[PDB]
Structure formats: structure tokens, C-alpha cells
Structure 1
Amino acid sequence: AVMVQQIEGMRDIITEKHVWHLSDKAIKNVYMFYIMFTCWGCLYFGSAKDPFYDSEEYRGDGGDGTGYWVYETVCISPFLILLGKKEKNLEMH
């Protein structure tokens, strides 16, 4: 572990070189513990009060959980107001 190395320019070096490794089993065990932590969180925080996707902000307007609900909504509500406008013109504005 201890080695003295001579160098012309500056000084001597007292290298130590603790060659180690986590080991094959401990690596498997940290994979195990992190997957178990992922299980615990996936269940618990999945059972947490998700404050955004519960209120009338998301779930109110549309809120299906898609990414086209905004665009299909603002493409439908024009159609709904146009249909209500035709219904209003059906009964003399």
C-alpha cells in the first residue's frame, strides 16, 4: 500500500492505493434495496394527496390526464358555443 516514489523535479510521493470494490453481492443488495424503496414510494406517494390532479383546475375544465385534452377542449368549446348560438338563432336570437 505505502510506496515512496522518487521524482527529479518536485518532491517524493507516499502513495497508498487502497484498491477496493463494493463487491458482487453488495451491488446486488443495493439494487435490491433501491427497488424496494421504489416499491415503497410507488405505493405510498401514489397514495398521497396529489394536489394538482385533484382540483377543479385540472379535473374541472377537462382533466382526463392526456396532453390533447387542452387542444380538443379549446377546439370543442368553440363548437359548443357555435351550437348554442345556432340553438339561440333557432328561437329568434
Structure 2
Amino acid sequence: NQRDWVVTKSIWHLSDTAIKSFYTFYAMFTVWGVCFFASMKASMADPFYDSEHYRGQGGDGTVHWYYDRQEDIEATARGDLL
């Protein structure tokens, strides 16, 4: 309503009301069933995960492949055998 508070230092009066989405909390979840549209933004090109400046695909592969050092020591042994 429009209750009229006569406060002891000023000239107030107010008006309030209660509102809440009745059941459209279902309809908004249905609309957010747009994750079924997560397929057009996945078939798009990958930025660099397919770029030529990338080989090795794990979570530590490219970073910690890093043991061509052993193969290089072996190549050194082979060159010494030559």
C-alpha cells in the first residue's frame, strides 16, 4: 500500500509491493538450454591448438617433452663410434 510515516525529524511516506517470478524459473532454465548451441562455436577453427607452431598434445607434453637430451647423448655416443 502507501503507508504514511510521520517520522520525528523529516517528512517520509512509502509504498512497497512483493514480487517474484511465479514459475518462469523453469522457462529461464529452458532458455539456458542454449548450451545445445555449443556446437557452432566448437566446429569453428582453433586459434593455435592446430597451428604449425605446436606438436605434442598432452598437459605436459610440449612443456616437458624435453628429453631429446638423452637422445642427443646417445647420438654423441654414436658419433664417437664413428
TM-score, normalization by structure 1: 0.72
Q: How does 1:37-52 map to 2 (within 5 A)?
A: 37-41=34-38, 43-52=39-48
Give the strand-richer structure, 1 or 2.
Answer: 2
Query: How many positions carry a matched residue from both structures?
Result: 81
TM-score, normalization by structure 2: 0.80
Note the residue ranges of structure 1 that are not aligned, 5 or more in a row: none
Query: Alignment partner of 1:18: what SS?
Result: strand
Q: Report the Cα offset of residue 85 of structure 1.
A: 1.9
Indicate the RMSD between aligned Cα atoms, in angstroms. Answer: 1.6
Match of 1:33 in 2: 31
Give the helix-richer structure, 1 or 2.
Answer: 1
Distance 1:2-1:55 versus aligned 2 partners, 3 A rule? same
Q: Percent identity?
A: 16
Note the residue ranges of structure 2 that are not aligned, 5 or more in a row: none
